[PDB]
Every structure is written in structure tokens, then in C-alpha cells.
Amino acid sequence: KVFGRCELAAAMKRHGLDNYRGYSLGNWVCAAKFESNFNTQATNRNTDGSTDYGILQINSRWWCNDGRTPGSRNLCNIPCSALLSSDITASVNCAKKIVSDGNGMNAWVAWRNRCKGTDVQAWIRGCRL
Ligand SMILES: [Cl-]
Ligand SMILES: [Cl-]
Ligand SMILES: [Cl-]
Ligand SMILES: [Cl-]
Ligand SMILES: [Cl-]
Ligand code: NA
């Protein structure tokens, strides 16, 4: 599923991401835009053989099991394929664990390079929330 901007903002708000660990909703929408272009089916392989999955590009090196990342962890206790669903619940719940692990949203490279320090409120401007 390819979300619209305001559609995704509303879904993320319903799932408790607005101001989660102090990160306003626009931060999460901006991260999803640049990680996946709002596409739940996005995948990208990393140099070390791990793979990033879904709307927030969560990495099989630490967070999910895909059966092909030897020596990795599965800290969200899910198969990585569950992060590709049109229902974003699994991605949101795993992202909550990630953002709580000490490094905040710096875990998302695209957030750090393209959202951090910008006017992220623009990503939810005009949306009925
Ligand atoms: Cl957009
Ligand atoms: Cl915001
Ligand atoms: Cl594995
Ligand atoms: Cl949902
Ligand atoms: Cl933080
Ligand atoms: Na893994």
C-alpha cells in the first residue's frame, strides 16, 4: 500500500506515535517519506547482507527475522514480512521499541539527514487529524 501523506499521519496518530518519546507527528511522517516514499512494500538490501523492510525500513540485523541474516537478532519478535503489510501496526510497534533504545530517531539515517532540524510540522500541514 502506498499511503497518502495525511492518510499516513492519521494512521500514525491513531497508533500513538504523536509525541512518542517526544517526537512530534511530523518527524514520523518525514522519516517514512524518505525511507520508503510511503510504500509499505519497500525493501532494500544492505552491504552486510541484512535487509530493510517496510514503511520505516526496519533492519533484519537487529529487529525482525527473515531467515537469511545469519547471526542477527529479532528484537521485535516478528517475521520481517509482517512489516510489509498494508496495516502499519507491526511497523509502529517495532518502531516504538527502536526509538526507545537510547538513540531516539537517529536510528533512521534518512531522518537524521533529511528531517532532523527542519520544519517537520510542514509534513502534517492541512491534514484533518
Ligand atoms: Cl508526499
Ligand atoms: Cl509535527
Ligand atoms: Cl536470520
Ligand atoms: Cl491499522
Ligand atoms: Cl531522544
Ligand atoms: Na534478524
Curated annotation (Swiss-Prot):
- Its main localization is secreted
The record places the active site at 35, 52
**GO:BP terms for this protein?**
cell wall macromolecule catabolic process; defense response to bacterium; defense response to Gram-negative bacterium; defense response to Gram-positive bacterium; killing of cells of another organism
Coiled-coil region list: none
Q: Is Lyase among the key words of this record?
A: no
Listed disulfide bonds for this chain? 6-127, 30-115, 64-80, 76-94
Instruction: Please give an example of a GO cellular component term from this record.
Output: cytoplasm
Q: In which tissues is it expressed?
A: In the egg white and polymorphonuclear leukocytes.
What InterPro entries does the entry give?
Glyco_hydro_22 (IPR001916), Glyco_hydro_22_CS (IPR019799), Glyco_hydro_22_lys (IPR000974), Lysozyme-like_dom_sf (IPR023346)
Q: Which UniProt keywords apply?
A: Allergen, Antimicrobial, Bacteriolytic enzyme, Disulfide bond, Glycosidase, Hydrolase, Secreted, Signal
Q: What is its EC number?
A: 3.2.1.17
- UniProt-annotated location(s): Secreted
| Recorded catalytic activity of this chain's protein | Hydrolysis of (1->4)-beta-linkages between N-acetylmuramic acid and N-acetyl-D-glucosamine residues in a peptidoglycan and between N-acetyl-D-glucosamine residues in chitodextrins
Q: Which family does it belong to?
A: Belongs to the glycosyl hydrolase 22 family.
Q: Tell me which PANTHER family the record gives.
A: LYSOZYME C (PTHR11407:SF28)
Q: What is the protein name for this chain?
A: Lysozyme C
Query: Which organism is this entry from?
Result: Gallus gallus (Chicken)
